[PDB]
Amino acid sequence: FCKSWGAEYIAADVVRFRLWATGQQKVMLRLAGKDQEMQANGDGWFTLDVAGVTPGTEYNFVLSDGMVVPDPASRAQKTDVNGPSYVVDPGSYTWRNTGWKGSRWEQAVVYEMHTGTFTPEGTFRAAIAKLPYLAELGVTVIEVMPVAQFGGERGWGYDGVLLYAPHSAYGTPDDFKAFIDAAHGYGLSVVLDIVLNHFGPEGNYLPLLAPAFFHKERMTPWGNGIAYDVDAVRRYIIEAPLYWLTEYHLDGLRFDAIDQIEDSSARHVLVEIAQRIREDITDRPIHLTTEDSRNIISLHPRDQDGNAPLFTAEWNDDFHNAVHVFATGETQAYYNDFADAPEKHLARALAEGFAYQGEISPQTGEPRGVKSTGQPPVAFVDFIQNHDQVGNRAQGDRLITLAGAERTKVLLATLLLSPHIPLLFMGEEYGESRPFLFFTDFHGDLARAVREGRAKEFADHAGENVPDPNAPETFQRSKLNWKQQHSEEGKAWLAFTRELLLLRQKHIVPLLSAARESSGTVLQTAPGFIAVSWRFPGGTLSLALNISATTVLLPDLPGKTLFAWPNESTGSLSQHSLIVRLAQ
Ligand SMILES: [Cl-]
Ligand SMILES: [Cl-]
Ligand SMILES: [Cl-]
Ligand SMILES: [Cl-]
Ligand SMILES: [Mg+2]
Ligand SMILES: [Mg+2]
Ligand SMILES: [Mg+2]
Ligand SMILES: [Mg+2]
Ligand SMILES: [Mg+2]
Ligand SMILES: [Mg+2]
């Protein structure tokens, strides 16, 4: 992929190095230790063409004063975020599965994976050995947490600063391509979590190169707001997703915190990103998902034939959040919006998409959301676990530890047989109980600021003892336990998950393509009990769930029984049970 920023081959034997640095009068290129002056070619841009440069050659930029910095648009770092960048050959990796052309979004079952903790080794190469396992299980889309190089050698990925460079701790560019290529061969699409709303705190020299890269007033909760209205900035931001998709042959992207991407440009940066992706990549579906707290739908339209010209689906945190209150009784902070009749919110989310479609949010005191019933069910990504819902907790508790195994089983089945697109957090499939903690790898003042900034999020829970994010044990405690995965109890969870996914592809997925609207109805709710129906062209799907300690009577649920757990009862649902039916 060809980019405005960075180091690219412009001929078989010539690399063009390009940097925008409005805060600088001059910039030098330090190439394999030797300094050459770059040409200032208007509007703060500096450029230099160098003949003969081989792939793997190290380089840095040197500022007017003598400060040595990584390429902010580095394609790869030699070691850490502050060290040399290196010239990458886009063609060094030989793609084997070039006939892959993806799969329809309707069959998506997403599996969110953190590269560093997914395996003991914590690398892309080690993760390849687990791909057959995931494919066998019935996962169809791997979502890789952000790989943009960040400070230190451990982190979730949201402190990324070199937005074009996969973290050297995970592997080289070719290691990541090998993982993607292998995934394709195993029948898995791969999407990447991408952060375009802020830069992390270590290794970001853009403020020193070009203060205008960031706004003077605007600040997100995690760093300065980005000046998307400035042409050079817009090039850096928009070309990043295009680069990842083209150069890494990815199947989509998940955009972090889009509600924190403020742009007053006539054409919003996110709209332009989506439009360019749909015009530039046409040989395969590209599944663009977004994380937005606003419960809008304007970025997820469908045309009459069901195509998504902008974004494909939206993270529907209302589902998780209603489930969490419903199943655990916790009502603090953002969960308080679901404290009143969580069953009603849950049923509404299942049936219609959003629980909040314009009603006042208790937590904000403002209207939240818009009508969502006209969206197809596949425009929502639902989940009972993800990196945030687990990791934003002081002790990183997984749902199974809060709701218990029996309740978690019926919630997992609910998720997997529902018409919304399901996302699983790595480890759920075998009943993992290890926490997923917030971990980092910083030093000095930054380490202290991050550690105390984290503790302060839980200061009102006085009694808490938040694990130091910088401590290696915080990271080690979060590693998936593959022993458990191989255990008998783990094999029971795996068998449960596997059957659910088979049932999903056999019975649910075929209903989804023709569904142009929610088509969902709440039949009944009561404390601990929901019953919902979806009327699709291909059949009427019904679901009822009871997590109360006593049996409940059911409405009529037409059709044959797709799944009943633990048992099926006629006209009733026992404690801690679920039933799913389909009438055709
Ligand atoms: Cl599709
Ligand atoms: Cl598409
Ligand atoms: Cl949300
Ligand atoms: Cl869980
Ligand atoms: Mg070549
Ligand atoms: Mg399959
Ligand atoms: Mg958010
Ligand atoms: Mg959302
Ligand atoms: Mg389609
Ligand atoms: Mg108001």
| Secondary structure, 3-state, 156-219 | CCCCCCEEEEECCCCCCHHHHHHHHHHHHHCCCEEEEEECCCCCCCCCCCHHHHCHHHEEEEEE
At a CB cut-off of 8 Å and minimum separation 6, what does 403 contact?
327, 328, 411
Give the residue among 550, 555, 560, 549 at the shortest CA–CA distance from 525.
555
- State the DSSP code for 53: P
N-term to C-term CA, the chain: 48
390 burial type by CB count under 10 A (0-12 exposed, 13-18 middle, 19+ buried) = buried
Residue type, 512: L
Which residues are 287's β-sheet partners?
252
Distance 88 CA to ligand 5 centre (A): 11
Distance 540 CA to ligand 7 centre (A): 34
Name the active-site residue from 256, 337, 343, 432: 256
Distance 351 CA to ligand 9 centre (A): 21
Contacts of 316-319 with CB under 8 Å at 24 or more apart are 316/349, 316/353, 316/354, 316/380, 316/381, 316/382, 316/420, 317/293, 318/345, 318/349, 318/354, 318/355, 318/356, 319/346, 319/349, 319/350, 319/355, 319/380, 319/382, 319/383, 319/420
- State the DSSP code for 38: P
Residue type, 536: F
Which residues are 141's β-sheet partners?
110, 189
Give the residue among 64, 71, 19, 69 at the shortest CA–CA distance from 46.
19
Measured distance CA(480)–CA(473) in Å, rounded: 13
* Percent of the chain as helix, strand, coil, to the nearest 5: 30, 25, 45
Distance 424 CA to ligand 4 centre (A): 9
Q: Which residues are annotated as a binding site for Mg(2+)?
A: 292, 314-315, 366
Q: What domains can you pick out in the chain, each with its CATH number? A: 1-96 (2.60.40.10), 97-439+478-514 (3.20.20.80), 440-477 (1.10.10.760), 515-584 (2.60.40.1180)
Measured distance CA(274)–CA(568) in Å, rounded: 46
Distance 291 CA to ligand 7 centre (A): 7
- Residue 102: CB atoms within 10 A of its CB come to 16
Measured distance CA(241)–CA(196) in Å, rounded: 9
Name the active-site residue from 291, 352, 429, 441: 291
Measured distance CA(407)–CA(412) in Å, rounded: 9
- Residue 221: CB atoms within 10 A of its CB come to 8
Alpha helices by DSSP H, listed for 435-531, are: 444-456, 472-476, 482-486, 488-503, 509-512
Q: H or E stretch including 271?
A: helix 269-280
Which one of the ligands is nearest to 365 CA? 10
Measured distance CA(296)–CA(275) in Å, rounded: 18
Measured distance CA(511)–CA(505) in Å, rounded: 10
CA angle, residues 359, 364, 367, in degrees to nearest 5: 25
- Residue 433: CB atoms within 10 A of its CB come to 14
- State the DSSP code for 507: I
Distance 582 CA to ligand 4 centre (A): 27
At a CB cut-off of 8 Å and minimum separation 6, what does 69 contact?
60, 61, 62, 63, 205, 208, 209
* Buried/exposed 269-292: b ≥16 CB within 10 Å, e otherwise: bbbbbbeebeeeeeebbbbbbbbb
Which one of the ligands is nearest to 299 CA? 8
Q: Evaluate whether 155 touches 119 at the Cβ level (below 8 Å).
A: no
Residue corresponding to tokens 């003969």? 52
Measured distance CA(74)–CA(18) in Å, rounded: 11
SS3 470: coil
195 half-sphere exposure, CB direction, 13 A CA radius: 24
At a CB cut-off of 8 Å and minimum separation 6, what does 482 contact?
119, 120
262 burial type by CB count under 10 A (0-12 exposed, 13-18 middle, 19+ buried) = middle
- Is 291 one of the annotated active-site residues of the chain? yes
Nominal resolution (angstroms): 1.4
Give the residue among 88, 58, 59 at the shortest CA–CA distance from 75.
88
Distance 486 CA to ligand 10 centre (A): 53
Which residues are 58's β-sheet partners?
86
Which one of the ligands is nearest to 361 CA? 10
469 half-sphere exposure, CB direction, 13 A CA radius: 27
Distance 133 CA to ligand 9 centre (A): 28
- State the DSSP code for 380: E
Q: H or E stretch including 45?
A: strand 45-51
Structural tokens at position 264: 């007053």
Which one of the ligands is nearest to 109 CA? 6
Residue type, 523: L
Distance 318 CA to ligand 3 centre (A): 6
Report residue 387: phi and psi, to 5°: -60, -35
Which protein residues have a CB closer than 5 Å to ligand 10 (ion)? 366
Q: Evaluate whether 535 touches 342 at the Cβ level (below 8 Å).
A: no
Which one of the ligands is nearest to 360 CA? 10
Report residue 123: phi and psi, to 5°: -125, 165
Which one of the ligands is nearest to 257 CA? 7
Give the residue among 303, 302, 549, 511 at the shortest CA–CA distance from 420.
511
Which residues are 27's β-sheet partners?
63
Report residue 364: phi and psi, to 5°: -105, -20
Q: State the helix-helix crossing angle for 405-417 and 317-328, rounded to 10 degrees.
A: 150
Measured distance CA(3)–CA(85) in Å, rounded: 16
- The Cα diameter of the chain in Å comes to 81
Structural tokens at position 284: 């395969």
Structural tokens at position 127: 């993760």
Report residue 51: phi and psi, to 5°: -80, 145
Three-state secondary structure along 249-270?
A: CCCEEEECCHHHCCCCCCCCHH
268 burial type by CB count under 10 A (0-12 exposed, 13-18 middle, 19+ buried) = middle
Residue corresponding to tokens 């009990």? 529
Distance 386 CA to ligand 3 centre (A): 13
Residue type, 311: F
Measured distance CA(353)–CA(349) in Å, rounded: 5
Which protein residues have a CB closer than 5 Å to ligand 5 (ion)? 91
Which one of the ligands is nearest to 308 CA? 2
Q: Which residues are annotated as a binding site?
A: 292, 314-315, 366
187 burial type by CB count under 10 A (0-12 exposed, 13-18 middle, 19+ buried) = middle
482 burial type by CB count under 10 A (0-12 exposed, 13-18 middle, 19+ buried) = middle
Structural tokens at position 137: 């299980």
Distance 142 CA to ligand 3 centre (A): 22
At a CB cut-off of 8 Å and minimum separation 6, what does 428 contact?
384, 385, 398, 400, 412, 497
474 torsion bin: left (phi>0), alpha (psi -120 to 50), beta (else): alpha
Measured distance CA(205)–CA(207) in Å, rounded: 5
* Buried/exposed 550-563: b ≥16 CB within 10 Å, e otherwise: eebebeebeeeebb
Structural tokens at position 396: 């990183």
Which residues are 520's β-sheet partners?
534
Alpha helices by DSSP H, listed for 26-105, are: none
Alpha helices by DSSP H, listed for 285-364, are: 317-328, 342-352
Give the residue among 191, 186, 173 at the shortest CA–CA distance from 74.
173
- Is 247 one of the annotated active-site residues of the chain? no
Distance 292 CA to ligand 8 centre (A): 4
